[PDB]
Amino acid sequence: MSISASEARQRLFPLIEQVNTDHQPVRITSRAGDAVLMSADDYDAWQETVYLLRSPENARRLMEAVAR
Template identity: 60%
Template structure:
């Protein structure tokens, strides 16, 4: 099952009498967690939505990745 989830990138629902669960790839889970974290702040969620809209309109500009201050 793990190989299938990692290869197909589709979640698998596991059902049991004690409750259900979902098996997803670690990469997908990490991506979801990051999205939740980034959208937690209303201001950040607005900036992200604005950036997506700009990219969809073709207004995005390439830039160097932000590395933070050292």
């Protein structure tokens, strides 16, 4: 799962299945710059958690509630 763009183009569909089951990023290569394909749920989860880390109480809340 570090591949050329032209191959990522043909395999796009299984690559979407993979990213949703694996939850690892796929590094895509090109003359145009590299891209990462990742699952929407991993992306959302990461952006949401970094937003919540704005408030240091929030991590304590989250940690405390898990361990319940």
